[PDB]
Every structure is written in C-alpha cells, then in structure tokens.
C-alpha cells in the first residue's frame, strides 16, 4: 500500500486555503454537486481516482495541481520532481490538463489584497446581488458567481478588464499576457 500511503502523506500537509484553491482549480472535472460535500484532500483524491485521472502509473495531474498552487516542497519531498522538469513538461503542447483560463484566474486571485478586494466588490455591486457580496466571500467565489451569470467567459472579458482597470495595472498585464497566449 505504498501509493495510498504516499497520497495520505501528501494530503496531510494541505490546509483549508489550499483545499479551497484545489477545489476551484478542479471545477472542469468535478461538478458542483460532488464539490459541495468535499471537506478534505482524501475525498478530492478519491473523486480524481474515480475518473481515472490519478493512479499508480499516472501522476501528471497531481503534479500539475501541486505546481499551480505553488507547493514545491511537497513535489520535491513526496514525489521526487523538480521545478525545471515540471516547467519543461508543461510547456510541451498537449500535456497541460488545466486550461490557461483557470490558471490566469487563480493567478489574478493570488494578487488581490483586502482593500483591493473591497474595491473589486464595490466596482461590481451593480450587476451582482449583495447575497454573494458578503465580507466572507473571497475572489474565487466572486469569479464562480460571475461565471454562473455568463458575464465572465473564455471569450468574454470586458467586465473583468473594466473592473481591474480601476484597481491596478499588473492585473491588466496578466490579462494581456493571457490574451497574447491565445
């Protein structure tokens, strides 16, 4: 039972915030109904295993998830993989199993402070009800809610650009980089 022990050791280190980030990043492969009862890393790993995206021979997806959420110590300890090799593998076309849309959304969410989050909320208190605009909601839930109302899509980015222009320029730089990659 070496593989299951390794997965348990990896899932031991993750905290609540990393669990939420993983749940957001794994939306395309797990529907909301399965997402709701997930409360720890073991349940998420079981869900990933059920779709045959994670097993003894195949470990690319777990490595990609760990790389995206910026946890390299786990990669170098419990998986024996370094940063350069992961980047080289990801740069190869067809290997990335997470679209650039989710990656850029998470990167944008990683660079917002509480004051900037409040500015983002105030910029979007018109098209969104106050129910999902409570102080407890972070940027990931706001992005999910906007995706639910088809005001933020893969080809639709007007609202995001307009709101980000009122806060910072670096976010617009990241959006421009994503558009360039497209």
């Amino acid at each position: 039972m070496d593989f299951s022990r390794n997965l348990y050791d990896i899932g031991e280190q993750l905290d609540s915030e990393d669990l939420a980030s993983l749940k957001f990043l794994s939306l395309d492969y797990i529907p909301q109904r399965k997402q709701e009862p997930i409360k720890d890393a073991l349940m998420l790993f079981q869900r990933l295993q059920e779709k045959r995206m994670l097993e003894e021979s195949n470990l690319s997806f777990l490595k990609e998830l760990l790389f995206r959420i910026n946890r390299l110590d786990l990669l170098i300890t419990y998986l024996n993989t370094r940063k350069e090799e992961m980047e080289r593998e990801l740069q190869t076309p067809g290997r990335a199993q997470i679209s650039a849309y989710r990656v850029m959304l998470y990167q944008i969410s990683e660079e917002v402070s509480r004051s900037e989050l409040r500015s983002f909320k105030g910029g979007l208190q018109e098209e969104i009800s106050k129910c999902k605009l409570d102080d407890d909601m972070n940027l990931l839930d706001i992005f999910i809610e906007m995706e639910k109302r088809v005001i933020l899509g893969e080809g639709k980015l007007d609202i995001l650009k307009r709101v980000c222009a009122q806060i910072n320029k670096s976010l617009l730089k990241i959006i421009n980089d994503y558009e360039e990659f497209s």
Partner: protein, 170 residues
C-alpha cells in the same frame, strides 16, 4: 457434503452475502428460482454439482476466507490451484457483475436506474437491476454496450476500464 456443512454455511452468512451467492448461482440453476440459500444448496446437492471443491470455490467467490479456514479445512492457495486446474462453475461474467456492483455506492444506482428508465418501467440494488436487465434481454455476455455506455455517462471510468479488460480477456 453432509447436512452439517450446509447448516453451518447457512448459519454463517448474512443477507448481503446470501443475495450475492444467489446471484452467482443463478445461472447453474437454469430453470429453478430458489427462495432461500438452503433451498439452493439442496438443489445443487441433489443435482450432483455440489462437492467439497465446488463449495470451497463458491465460498471463495463470496470472499469469506475464515469459513474456508474453519469449515472446509482449506486455505486460499489450495482453492486457487483448484481453480487453475479444474474448470470452475460460475462464469467470468457473473463474477465481473458482482465486482462491478460491489464498487457502486448507494447513490449511483439511483442515477443509473433513472437513466435506464426509458427502456423499462423501491430500494433497487445493482444486482437486482442487472437481473431485470438480463430478463429484458438488454445485457448479455455478448452484449455489454449498454452497461459500458451508461457507466461512462455517470462518470465512472474505472468500471468502464474493468469492462474493457474483461472484453479483451475473452
């Protein structure tokens, strides 16, 4: 062999293993539907298809190894070798169905029956559902397309892998 062994086996098993045993022995009793495991074992003994080796094999399929270590005075290695040499009773299709039904939880079967309701007409288990499907001539060892497609649709690809592996074996 003797009635003592049959009585002990009936006393040992619970309801779920009893239903699995009935499903496994469904094909060998081609025309008789038994209501109890006692009746099934009596029928097998009368027909002459029950012996020490066959009973050990049947108990091994249900995964009750302590019964082999206690009643039949046999371990798993001996029954494994007997399976390797002597041809077995239950077909591979029945044990594949049992293996698939073991992994489906108490909720996925409801979604599966909701999907499949269009081809037919209430705590149904997967074994009962597959018995109904076999009754309606929709699932057969030659026709496994419906089950594979429906298992793919509910996003259970490990079971689809199992079905594909079984098809490749035969």
């Amino acid at each position: 062999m003797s009635a003592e062994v049959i009585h002990q086996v009936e006393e040992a098993l619970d309801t779920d293993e009893k239903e699995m045993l009935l499903f496994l022995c469904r094909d060998v009793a081609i025309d008789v539907v038994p209501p109890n495991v006692r009746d099934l074992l009596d029928i097998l003994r009368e027909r002459g298809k029950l012996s020490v080796g066959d009973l050990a094999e049947l108990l091994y399929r249900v995964r009750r190894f302590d019964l082999l270590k206690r009643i039949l005075k046999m371990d798993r290695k001996a029954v494994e070798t007997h399976l390797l040499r002597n041809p077995h009773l239950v077909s591979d299709y029945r044990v594949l169905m049992a293996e698939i039904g073991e992994d489906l939880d108490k909720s996925d079967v409801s979604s599966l029956i909701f999907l499949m309701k269009d081809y037919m007409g209430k705590e149904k288990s997967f074994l009962d559902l597959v018995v109904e499907l076999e009754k309606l001539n929709l699932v057969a060892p030659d026709q496994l397309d419906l089950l594979e497609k429906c298992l793919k649709n509910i996003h259970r690809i490990d079971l689809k892998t199992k079905i594909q592996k079984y098809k490749q074996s035969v």
